[model samples]
Target: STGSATTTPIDSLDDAYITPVQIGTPAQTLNLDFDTGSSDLWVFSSETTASEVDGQTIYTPSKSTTAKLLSGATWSISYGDGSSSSGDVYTDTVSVGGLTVTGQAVESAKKVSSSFTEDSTIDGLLGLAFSTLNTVSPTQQKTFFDNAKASLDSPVFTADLGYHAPGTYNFGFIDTTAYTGSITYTAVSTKQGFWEWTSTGYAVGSGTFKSTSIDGIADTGTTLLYLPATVVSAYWAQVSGAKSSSSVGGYVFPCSATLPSFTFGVGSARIVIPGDYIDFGPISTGSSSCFGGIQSSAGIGINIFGDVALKAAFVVFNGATTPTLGFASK
Candidate 1:
């Protein structure tokens, strides 16, 4: 059987896509960010100090009759954006859409970093990456997907991300009606515990496609697309009044600037990102500056095909024998 859930953007920040998830026998529901960049299913919980709880709805493990503590086990996770959370481990029933997994590891946060405490809407993160990256100590824990994969009709999941619109995440099956044209398949290198792949080349606007393999990860958790410095510079050079902004921490252009389309090659198919999508949004209300969704991947060794890029195509995180990534236009 297949499972599907609607995903909605968090505010105008476009920082994350969240969906409702249920935990425990009585099914206590919470909004969780479906993150593919990390492997830890953690939630703010009653164990957290009241002062640090902020506006988040905490998960009370004691309320779940099926909850069982994994004695002495704990988990801690840090993100690229500096957000972090840590907690004790418990095994419980976790459900999403119509699919449910019994005895899934659910980390209950006792402590959270300032970044997490400040964000009130995101109650937790449901990691979609490989279970190898799980943060639980002594013994790494399996994610809900890993625990349910064995019973799924098909061992695959699809992410249909959208721009300022509702999207859907499908499990155990691929919805052929969700995408147009033939899907282009790319071999995934999961040695790094991510959906990593090499793009054959890329092009700016309708310009000539450059033949240079660029390695990157498809990260649903990240807000912006990141590429090598040179590639980012090349794209910005074509836009008038565009320059790197130290204060903004990325390339920014005039609000009225006409940006060009960006395209990445997978096999013979080209996944194109329209110019309007590249304009993340105005830096601030009434400001003439706007941050470019495409930023330079300077410190990070690998490029990131974040939400900005992923929303341009319908993506499939195939978990078959040879893990592959399939991309098609919406």
Candidate 2:
């Protein structure tokens, strides 16, 4: 699989950054989350009670002049993070990357929590993660990708960082710089609906697992990588002088140490997860210890490759071309 050329910068929401592109004239913009774990394009509207959208950027249909709400049915979403929102459904003139789709059914929350109420930076989430998690009604269900598919220059979606800021996420056509070389393609599995892969091995502090074997799906919504405890222990055992830190929940080894890079095999493509990612976020402590990527998520059934691993490589979903994922880096 391969990555694509970079698209323009969108806007930000909550603390998650995004790219806002003019979808249609009278220029209405949509703030998309560009998620890889779920699919759906949702926005809050004026029909929602002010209390429900206290901190969110809710759109006003009256202002759009062309916007409309779908069935009067109410919509609600409960996130894994314990955050939830409920609102009325509406059909509006929606646009993304300058493409407009009239009568696109979107959600407008009538009730929301403080976490969502505290942020005006983002208006709503444009889920591009995966279609499996689409929550819209069957009759009106559609993803931003589904709506934008006909208008895109390429079928690929590119995610680029906006300065490390949480809300600074951007998406569109994949950026060439996002990959190291040509895109590495992988076939889509029909079983779990997740992009699965066999990892070649892992490396830490000059140690490498050339024969390591593991399978999991890459998810953008999950903030951290979840691996089996056995694999986590085995990988941690490799770092020569590393020790666990009292403050951190995951593994932490010496940051100054010579950490080796990890490469996984998906067919013939060898994707690497950098050592720096091992250092969870940034450290305020003066300690030299760096955090390890893999964590325990056994009972969860599904193993998710989160932001830590995703930022390291270029990933492409074949929803647009074939039912495959293409990987590449710049």
Candidate 3:
């Protein structure tokens, strides 16, 4: 069987993408970030501190007959962007789209950092990465994908993110019509818990392709496309008014500046990113400059293929043992 769900950008900025998830027997639904960079299905819940829940929908486990607290089990997560959450664990029937998993671990947050409270677009995170990265102590739990893998007609899920519109997440199947050209598949590295892989290379618009192999992860959880410093600098050099800002931080260019398209390789396939997608958004209200969707991973240690890149292609996370990643231009 298969499942499908619509994921939409929360606002005009496309800052966060959210999809609805149902938990408990009666279905306590909440919009969650369908994240692939981490492996924990955590949520804003009744257990959360009152002051920490802004406008997010909180799950009430006590109201669900199927909810069972996993005594002594707890979890904590610290994100790269400094947002954090810590909570108790409970097992309950949960479903994403139409894919159901009985006795699924649903982390109920008791505490959350300031960043999370201020952002109401997402009520939780439903991680699709390898279960090995789960933060639960004493016992690790299977992620939604892993728990549903065996029952899935095909152990695969696809991400079709759009630039300024709603996209979709499909489970157990691939929609050929969502993309153009043939899919280019590549081996995923088991060396990391994330959906890590090496990109064959990249090229700035109208430039010759670079043959360097860039190791990165397909992280839908993240916002920007982070590559090596050299690559980032090269792209910005082509933009006449672009500069790496010291005070504002990262790279910024005139809002009206013409941007060149970006292309990355997967096997023999080329996934081209439209120039418009790279102009992330205006850094501040009424500003004449905007932030670059692509940035340098210099201090981050690993290249990250995030929303900026994934939104340009149809991505498939093949759940085979020693997995593979599939990419197709849409």
Candidate 4:
């Protein structure tokens, strides 16, 4: 089956993208964050205490006749940003766009961290990563994409993330109309449970492109672009008045500072992130200080091509024989 879904930015946050998805036999719709960095389809559910759940919509499995409890099965997840959730499991039909996956493992959250509980816009997370990354106990579960892949016209999906705008996530087929110029394909290594790849190098603004190979993952869930400390220092050094601030965290600069564009090399192709996107808005309201979107990934180990970087281009996640990532101008 072939299907496509429209993804919209969560309110005005411009941090996470949410897509509508139907779950269970009667079809309860939930706005799920399609995360490529993770591999679990979890939602706020009836199992969650009312006090624990804020204004978020909760899924009621009892209302769906097809929902069956997976005895003793459970799931717990912790995100890189310290957000976490844990809950029981159930098997039910899950559909996105027009594509349906029967008996898909659905993790229902009974408890969630303050990070998730506070963000009421996103109801759940729809993981698009490899099935091996699933968090179910005893036997791991397959993601919605993994379960639906065999029935798809093509084992591929494309992520067209927009900056404070709407985008589209197409499954089974690539929409050539969504992108311009030639699609530059790169080899991907999924050993780390992510769409991990190495960039040939990167450069600050129109300056010379460095040849240092940087390994990182294409993460849609993460908000900011994370690079090596040295690389981050090099870029921030060019920005006058930019300095690492303890109060704001990371590198902060004056909002009026003229920022330089950042570019990353994907083989022979280059993906350029605009200067405006680099200045990730103000650190706080009424404050003249603004935090840089590109921060140091010193403690994180690996660099992350988060929404800040991913939104700059149209990305294709190929799940064929040899997994690959295709990039092009939007």
Q: For candidate 4, lDDT tens digit of each residue in 246-298?
A: 77679999998999999998889999998887877778778889889999999
lDDT per residue for candidate 3 within 136-249, as digits (tens), equals 998998898999999999999999998999999999999999999888899898566899999999999999999889999999999989999999999999999999998887
Model 1 misplaced regions, further than 4 Å? none
- Model 1: lowest-lDDT 10 consecutive positions: 10-19
Q: What tens digits encode model 2's per-residue C-alpha lDDT throughout 36-94?
A: 66655666657666765655555666676665656546556775556766666666666
Tell me each candidate's TM-score: 0.98, 0.76, 0.98, 0.98
Q: Using lDDT as the measure, which candidate wins?
A: 3
Q: Candidate 4, residue 59: CA error in Å?
A: 0.6
State, as a TM-score between 0 and 1, how close model 1 is to the true structure. Answer: 0.98
The order by descending lDDT is 3, 4, 1, 2
Local error of candidate 2 at residue 328 (angstroms)? 1.5
Candidate that beats the other on TM-score, 3 or 4, i.e. the better one: 3
Ten consecutive residues with minimal summed lDDT in candidate 2?
5-14
* Residue 228 lDDT (model 1): 95
Tens-place lDDT per residue, model 1, 10-74, is 88757788899999978889899998888899998989867788888878999999999999999
**Which 10 residues in a row give candidate 3 its minimum summed lDDT?**
184-193
